[PDB]
């Protein structure tokens, strides 16, 4: 009918890598065209904040708008576990609609990284699996990476993470190499970046 | 609005093990007290079929029903890629909406089934994790248990099946166990059940 709001969280990157921008996402569908104007109010912790930008409007062709305020995030702030409200505001609505967002709450806990090694049954192929296990941690926000002699390794599968009995989360992640790139003792490194890590970053090797 | 309708397949386990009933289930909610009767049309590959049985009428709290139709499918039709449309009339409807489900399309590609022991780096720890990869499987539907000395072993957890770089799914489950139930040599299996494993079953086992 009248509008719906959708509020989106950062990547789990971008609120761990000192490189990115982390931002919390406002999306309002289904704004008419008699009604194109939406306010947006954003409150950090209940604190009305003012520096939140709306992006270009968007026109849908089933005649309606999509209209999205983007609120930057201090990467700490998110962390911490502050809570970010969105209010919406359109002539549409008979009242506001809020949404609210933040980190899953409880307590960290520090990843622990795995690596293991191809099955001998699997070495009856061209292309083996080289296996991260990350287990124990929480939140369940986290990144991981390859890398092989100094050098980004691309052909790689991530999980999602799975809730484990313990209330932490785990995940694999599958590299997929050529057998004799095994066999000839390079060295492979599985990446983690989640907010438990020192430095937010660890990094564990795998060779033959 | 009126009436949706959502179709669901059954349980992978259902249509791969001969002891259990797989069937189609047409759910029907937002059915007014106003038109309670919906009528329910199926049609295997086409052609109507007149054995499906409607569940009892739920009234939710919200003043509408869930009316539900079950379709029992034969393990054979399911598997083979029959397509099962369920056809739902009701007065608020001012047209009969239709759904459609079937098994995934593609060549079926066996499980490859890999146990990895737990990491040394695990061994600090007084529970260690086993894991089963399963690989180059197509299509996605599969089943995954653990057991030790004939018995069920229930402490673990599976992740949900991923999309890999060449068309096929891969998975892993983890078996969390005593660190001296697995010094002590005790043999532990991964049972795989899926529709290209010769009789639909594999087991792998692992131990120290
Ligand atoms: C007219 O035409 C319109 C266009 O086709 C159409 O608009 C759609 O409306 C839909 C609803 O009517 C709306 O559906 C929702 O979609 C949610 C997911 O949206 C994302 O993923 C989609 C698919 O991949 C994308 O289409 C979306 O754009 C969106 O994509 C994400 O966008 C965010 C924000 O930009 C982005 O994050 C930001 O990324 C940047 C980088 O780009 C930075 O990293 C930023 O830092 C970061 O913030 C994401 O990366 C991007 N992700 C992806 C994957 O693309 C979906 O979550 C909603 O599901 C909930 O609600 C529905 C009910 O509608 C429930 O069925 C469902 O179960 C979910 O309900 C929740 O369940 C929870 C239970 O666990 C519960 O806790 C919650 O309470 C509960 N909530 C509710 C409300 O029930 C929902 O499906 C869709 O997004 C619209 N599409 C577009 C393109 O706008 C419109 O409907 C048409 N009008 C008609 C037909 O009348
Ligand atoms: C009044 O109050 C009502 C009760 O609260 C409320 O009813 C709800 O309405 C919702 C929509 O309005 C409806 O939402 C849909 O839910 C789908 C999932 O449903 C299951 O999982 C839920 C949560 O776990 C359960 O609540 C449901 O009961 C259902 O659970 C499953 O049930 C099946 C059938 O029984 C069962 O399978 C059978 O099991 C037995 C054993 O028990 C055997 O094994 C049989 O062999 C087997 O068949 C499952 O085991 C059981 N599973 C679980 C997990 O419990 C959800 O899939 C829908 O999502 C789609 O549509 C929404 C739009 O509504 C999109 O946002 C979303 O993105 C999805 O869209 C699809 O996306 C695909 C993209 O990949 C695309 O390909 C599709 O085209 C696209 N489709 C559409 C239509 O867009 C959806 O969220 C909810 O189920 C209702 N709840 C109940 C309890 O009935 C009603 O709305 C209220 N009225 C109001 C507010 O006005």
Same mark, same amino acid.
């Given at each position: 009918?009248?509008?719906?709001?959708?509020?989106?969280?950062?990547?789990?990157?971008?609120?761990?890598?000192?490189?990115?921008?982390?931002?919390?996402?406002?999306?309002?569908?289904?704004?008419?065209?008699?009604?194109?104007?939406? $306010?947006?109010?954003?409150?950090?912790?209940?604190?009305?904040?003012?520096? !939140? %930008?709306?992006? #270009? @409007? /968007?026109? =849908?062709?089933?005649?309606?708008?999509?209209?999205?305020?983007?609120?930057?995030?201090?990467?700490?702030?998110?962390?911490?576990?502050?809570?970010?409200?969105?209010?919406?505001?359109? $002539?549409?609505?008979?009242?506001?609609?809020?949404?609210?967002?933040?980190? !899953? %709450?409880?307590? #960290? @806990? /520090?990843? =622990?990284?795995?690596?293991?090694?191809?099955?001998?049954?699997?070495?009856?192929?061209?292309?083996?699996?080289?296996?991260?296990?990350?287990?124990?941690?929480?939140?369940?926000?986290?990144?991981?990476?390859?890398?092989?002699?100094?050098?980004?390794?691309?052909?790689? %599968?991530?999980? #999602?993470?799975?809730?484990?009995?313990?209330?932490?989360?785990?995940?694999?992640?599958?590299?997929?190499?050529?057998?004799?790139?095994?066999?000839?003792?390079?060295?492979?490194?599985?990446?983690?970046?989640?907010?438990?890590?020192?430095?937010?970053?660890?990094?564990?090797?795998?060779?033959?």
């Amino acid at each position: 009918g009248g509008p719906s709001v959708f509020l989106f969280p950062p990547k789990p990157k971008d609120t761990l890598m000192i490189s990115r921008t982390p931002e919390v996402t406002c999306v309002v569908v289904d704004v008419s065209h008699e009604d194109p104007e939406v $306010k947006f109010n954003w409150y950090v912790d209940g604190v009305e904040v003012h520096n !939140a %930008k709306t992006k #270009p @409007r /968007e026109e =849908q062709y089933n005649s309606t708008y999509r209209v999205v305020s983007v609120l930057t995030v201090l990467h700490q702030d998110w962390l911490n576990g502050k809570e970010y409200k969105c209010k919406v505001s359109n $002539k549409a609505l008979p009242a506001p609609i809020e949404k609210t967002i933040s980190k !899953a %709450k409880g307590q #960290p @806990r /520090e990843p =622990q990284v795995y690596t293991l090694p191809p099955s001998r049954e699997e070495m009856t192929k061209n292309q083996v699996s080289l296996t991260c296990l990350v287990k124990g941690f929480y939140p369940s926000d986290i990144a991981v990476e390859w890398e092989s002699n100094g050098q980004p390794e691309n052909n790689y %599968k991530t999980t #999602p993470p799975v809730l484990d009995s313990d209330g932490s989360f785990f995940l694999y992640s599958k590299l997929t190499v050529d057998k004799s790139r095994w066999q000839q003792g390079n060295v492979f490194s599985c990446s983690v970046m989640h907010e438990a890590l020192h430095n937010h970053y660890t990094q564990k090797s795998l060779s033959l």
